[PDB]
């Protein structure tokens, strides 16, 4: 065992993903610092140009800070807009860098670790 006394710098990495040019044009990654009306307009403008990609739903998608924010947007489309939505809860794994632990600079040795969080995918139909 070992306590995580890793107050030294940690460079969090984005979660590994893979796309197919069909999930490019029918998916939104809600960031933590996304203004509400920004994502509202984005979603409102994908539900108008998704038929030509041969699809029937838009996959809003977020974790951490995003989740409640994400859910709020879902609410705004459930009622007061009259659309049907599906909710899925997912688990996600990401990678974090940690140093191996004169005076040297930031350029130190690197070791990878795996840490898991949870998020939500939310499919809004047309």
């Amino acid at each position: 065992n070992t306590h995580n006394k890793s107050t030294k710098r940690v460079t969090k990495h984005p979660s590994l993903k893979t796309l197919t040019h069909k999930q490019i044009h029918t998916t939104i990654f809600v960031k933590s610092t996304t203004p509400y009306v920004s994502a509202l307009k984005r979603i409102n403008k994908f539900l108008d140009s998704v038929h030509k990609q041969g699809s029937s739903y838009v996959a809003v998608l977020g974790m951490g800070k995003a989740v409640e924010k994400t859910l709020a947007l879902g609410c705004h489309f459930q009622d007061q807009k009259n659309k049907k939505i599906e909710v899925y809860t997912k688990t996600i794994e990401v990678l974090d860098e940690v140093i191996t632990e004169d005076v040297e600079d930031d350029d130190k040795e690197t070791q990878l670790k795996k840490r898991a969080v949870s998020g939500v995918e939310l499919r809004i139909y047309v």
């Binding site: 009622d79 007061q80 807009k81 009259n82």
Partner: protein
């Protein structure tokens, strides 16, 4: 150079203005009551004739000739009273003045002529009209179960006014 233009989108509201009615209060009912269709006695000629009458009386010869040079009525529907008119860019305000200071079209009485937007190109007022109809349909289908408005004064009309008379490129 090339001559500019402005397009005006005008609706007709038929308020009830009659006593002993005591209507209900809700965003659905007010719109569903004020937006009844036109009695079909009005036509494409009656509106133009009345808007010419209202100019040579509230304005003079030099006010009724700077607008009558180019004033054409393009599209008008009876199921929903929306219509589109065209005029010069520098002489659009006088047409608006004709619009407000005019009521009692022909013989029909008790009504309001309402210009809702003015724009330069013709491609954009079509998109505006589509968005307006979508907004009305959304607000009428959200107060409750939609089919409580089963009288179908306007519900079957917005979908069916798609491009039937709007192919004026």
């Amino acid at each position: 150079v090339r001559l500019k233009s402005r397009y005006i989108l005008f609706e007709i509201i038929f308020p009830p203005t009659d006593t002993n009615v005591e209507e209900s209060v809700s965003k659905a009912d007010i719109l569903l009551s004020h937006h009844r269709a036109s009695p079909a006695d009005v036509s494409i000629k009656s509106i133009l004739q009345e808007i010419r009458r209202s100019l040579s009386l509230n304005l003079g010869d030099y006010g009724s000739a700077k607008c009558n040079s180019l004033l054409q009525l393009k599209y008008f529907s009876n199921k929903t009273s929306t219509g589109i008119i065209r005029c010069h860019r520098e002489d659009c305000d006088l047409v608006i003045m004709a619009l407000m200071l005019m009521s009692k079209i022909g013989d029909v009485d008790g009504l309001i002529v309402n210009p809702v937007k003015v724009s330069g190109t013709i491609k954009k007022i079509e998109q505006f009209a589509m968005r307006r109809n979508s907004k009305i349909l959304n607000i009428i289908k959200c107060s409750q179960s939609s089919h409580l408005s089963d009288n179908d004064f306007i519900i079957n009309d917005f979908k069916k006014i798609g491009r039937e008379n709007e192919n004026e490129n």
